[PDB]
Ligand binder design. Structure first.
Ligand SMILES: *[C@@H]1O[C@H](CO)[C@@H](O[C@@H]2O[C@H](CO)[C@@H](O[C@@H]3O[C@H](CO)[C@@H](O)[C@H](O)[C@@H]3O)[C@H](O)[C@H]2NC(C)=O)[C@H](O)[C@H]1NC(C)=O
Ligand SMILES: *[C@@H]1O[C@H](CO)[C@@H](O)[C@H](O)[C@H]1NC(C)=O
Lengths: 185, 111, 140, 303
């Protein structure tokens, strides 16, 4: 049993439940996988797409581009002398992916609360799981400050952006789960 | 020549009207965007009756389809018959060694 | 527990002298009968196994010259050591012993800059100490 | 408009309504200049036009075919003509048939069995002869020579109704050397169906994970527990499925209904224990554990 793998399995399950709630709440807003384009915020910032691979799959090492964002932050999920750099860079990039998403999700939630009705709001449990996993991934975890606005934003745009992020995040959550399973075995 | 119209003149030497019994009710309809069907009824029956659908394009290059004892034929856009411009269609049957002609009908054929 | 891979003594053993004799025995008891293992006497050096050197650094003698200096770090009480100078493409031979230096100096290394795997091991005692596991390979 | 599908082949786009005027079509020959070039459409020596240039509006299919560039008694060049019918402003789709299983207007159905990127696409067409297919593929549009599609082959000749639909399939492998954990661009496959003088094209976009269909579980065996009614059943991962088996995982659903309506049990473990009625079979199915995927074929062992 791997504790980070348990957190990652909790993350994928939490996103799956939130995604189901989002489809039910926003009946008109189009939130089916077919009608929602895949857009990834972390497209160029992080190297999870390349660094997070089984050791057998990655060989030439040429594609790792000049140790891109090679922070290699030390953390409680692995041990400093336990695994190869290929997994050390991957764990740092996964931490960065969760930081980029959590900062955005909190911004969306703060705008959603202002709605006169409560049609939809991001799951507090899902946000807590993202923070718990980041704390294990990197010791120098930064907790996002409470975000708020002094004005009211258009709600339709936030609800379309929300659906686009949730689906992309779910794909990211499976990718983290596969890496955690590989680390355990 | 294979399931497609032949521009060459029909083999039988004489097309002279043969007898009171004649093919009748020649009608062509569009089964599908590229499928079509023409139906003709022969008044007098024969064990060896052979049915031929001879048509003529606006150009006047009349051509004859080949069929064997059938009241119906199905053809596609590239049989040779024009399926956008005007095109006459008529039926001839060689039974008893006399060739009778169904009344000629001109149909757009796109409907 | 009915099946035990091993039993661990929480207390660390500090040996009054490096040459001491400590004896260990295991007893198995069941409703039907009891079997006890023969006493085995172990000196402290036999029980201790040095940790693989955690640190590694490659420097070409602060120059473009072929000679290479390797700056590693490990447990303080090591009186011996061994280094892998084998070419990365084909393993050849690794020196049996290195001097008692944390930082290798004037090691013979190939003139090309092609990536070379590096592995390091240390021996706590030459006379009766187990070799440490090879350190994580260092690429180039 | 007139565009060249390939050298010596020119597809012409024509509107399809009754009494339609044709596009002015110009024929040119890339040969040393000859005074008196003649031009034929049919194999017959009827001569259509003279000069290195021939003008002929393609008002109907009869006016499309292999125009021949011949002078001096030698055929200088060749000018095959292909037609892309457009009906009510909508491109014609006659060569292939709408399966409709995923949704309407679906003529291409693709599948995969591994994360390697090897995939096969099946298209059902009812045209017996004179049929050719051109297949090209790429990841998004950025990868040049991204995918190496193979050549169409007839696969089956079933008799649905009386039409006898024939199924043609292509084998395509992602030729990208760099391994990547997640896909950001959908693979796009284009089939340029050609029949006689008629040209049609079909485009399908998809992701490998979505089209993945696992092969049936391997080495299924039943081992009865000693002195117990239940029987332990053990199965193994398919060799074809991508490795390692830790990063890529499958979920096994076991149904014991054989021949009570639903004995299906979903077990991640490779061995499950099920009471075995003497008069039934035990069957196992495999699906991607991580994402929703097409279910595998049932693997049945007699019990
Ligand atoms: C699928 O079939 C359609 C039907 O022809 C193709 O669209 C046509 O594509 C050709 C090739 O690009 C176009 O011809 C040429 O286009 C270029 C670029 O605009 C231009 O420089 C040339 O002068 C000529 O126009 C043609 O215009 C276009 N037809 C329409 C109505 O846009 C399409 O390419 C086919 N796709 C595949 C993958 O085969
Ligand atoms: C330990 O035992 C060995 C043999 O029994 C003996 O040679 C050695 O001197 C002993 N060591 C001590 C410290 O008594």
């Amino acid at each position: 049993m791997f504790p980070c793998l348990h957190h990652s399995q909790n993350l994928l399950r939490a996103v799956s439940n939130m995604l189901q709630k989002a489809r039910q709440t926003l009946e008109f807003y189009p939130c089916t996988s077919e009608e929602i384009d895949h857009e990834d915020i972390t497209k160029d910032k992080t190297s999870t797409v390349e660094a997070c691979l089984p050791l057998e799959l990655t060989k030439n090492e040429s594609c790792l581009n000049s140790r891109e964002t090679s922070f290699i932050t030390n953390g409680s999920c692995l041990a400093s002398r336990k695994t190869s750099f290929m997994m050390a860079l991957c764990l740092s990039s996964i931490y960065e992916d969760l930081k980029m998403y959590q900062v955005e999700f909190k911004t969306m939630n703060a705008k959603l609360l202002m709605d006169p009705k409560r049609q939809i709001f991001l799951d507090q449990n899902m946000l807590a799981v993202i923070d718990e996993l980041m704390q294990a991934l990197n010791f120098n975890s930064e907790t996002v400050p409470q975000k708020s606005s002094l004005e009211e934003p258009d709600f339709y745009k936030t609800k379309i952006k929300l659906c686009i992020l949730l689906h992309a995040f779910r794909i990211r959550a499976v990718t983290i789960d596969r890496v955690m399973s590989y680390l355990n075995a | 020549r294979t399931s497609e119209c032949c521009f060459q003149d029909p083999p039988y030497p004489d097309a002279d009207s043969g007898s009171a019994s004649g093919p009748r009710d020649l009608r062509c309809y569009r089964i599908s965007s590229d499928r079509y069907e023409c139906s003709w009824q022969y008044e007098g029956p024969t064990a060896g009756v052979s049915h031929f659908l001879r048509c003529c394009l606006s150009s006047g290059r009349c051509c004859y389809f080949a069929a064997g004892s059938a009241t119906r034929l199905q053809f596609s856009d590239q049989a040779g018959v024009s399926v956008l411009y005007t095109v006459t269609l008529w039926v001839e049957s060689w039974a008893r060694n006399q060739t009778e002609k169904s009344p000629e009908v001109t149909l757009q054929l796109y409907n | 527990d009915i099946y035990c891979d091993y039993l661990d003594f929480g207390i660390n053993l500090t040996p009054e002298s490096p040459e001491s004799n400590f004896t260990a025995k295991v007893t198995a008891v069941n409703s039907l009968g009891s079997s006890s293992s023969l006493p085995s006497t172990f000196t402290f050096l036999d029980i201790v196994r040095p940790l693989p050197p955690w640190d590694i650094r490659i420097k070409f003698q602060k120059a473009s010259v072929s000679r290479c200096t390797l700056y590693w770090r490990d447990e303080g009480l090591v009186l011996l050591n061994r280094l892998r100078y084998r070419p990365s493409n084909s393993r050849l031979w690794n020196m049996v012993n290195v001097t008692k230096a944390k930082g290798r100096h004037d090691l013979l290394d190939l003139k090309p800059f092609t990536e070379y795997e590096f592995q390091i091991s240390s021996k706590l005692h030459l006379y009766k100490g187990s070799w440490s596991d090879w350190s994580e390979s260092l690429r180039a | 408009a007139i565009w060249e599908l390939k050298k010596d082949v020119y597809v012409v786009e024509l509107d399809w309504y009754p009494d339609a005027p044709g596009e002015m079509v110009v024929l040119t020959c890339d040969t040393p200049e000859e005074d008196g070039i003649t031009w034929t459409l049919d194999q017959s020596s009827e001569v259509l036009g003279s000069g290195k240039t021939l003008t002929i509006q393609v008002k109907e299919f009869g006016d499309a075919g292999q125009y021949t560039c011949h002078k001096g008694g030698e055929v200088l060049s060749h000018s095959l003509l292909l037609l892309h019918k457009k009906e009510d402003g909508i491109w014609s789709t006659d060569i292939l048939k709408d399966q409709k299983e995923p949704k309407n207007k679906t003529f291409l159905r693709c599948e995969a069995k591994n994360y390697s990127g090897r995939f096969t696409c099946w298209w059902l067409t009812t045209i017996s002869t004179d049929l050719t297919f051109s297949v090209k593929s790429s990841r998004g549009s950025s990868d040049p020579q991204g995918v190496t599609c193979g050549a169409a082959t007839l696969s089956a000749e079933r008799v649905r109704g009386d039409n006898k639909e024939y199924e043609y399939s292509v084998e395509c492998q992602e030729d990208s050397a760099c391994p990547a954990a997640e896909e950001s661009l959908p693979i796009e496959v284009m089939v340029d169906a050609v029949h006689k003088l008629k040209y049609e094209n079909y485009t399908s976009s998809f992701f490998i994970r979505d089209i993945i269909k696992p092969d049936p579980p391997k080495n299924l065996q039943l081992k009865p527990l000693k002195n117990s009614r239940q029987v332990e059943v053990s199965w193994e991962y398919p060799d074809t499925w991508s490795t390692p088996h830790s990063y890529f995982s499958l979920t096994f659903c076991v149904q014991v209904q054989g021949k009570e309506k639903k004995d299906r049990v979903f077990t991640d473990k490779t061995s499950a224990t099920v009471i075995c009625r003497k008069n039934a079979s035990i069957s196992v199915r495999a699906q991607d554990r991580y994402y929703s995927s097409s279910w595998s074929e049932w693997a049945s062992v007699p019990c």
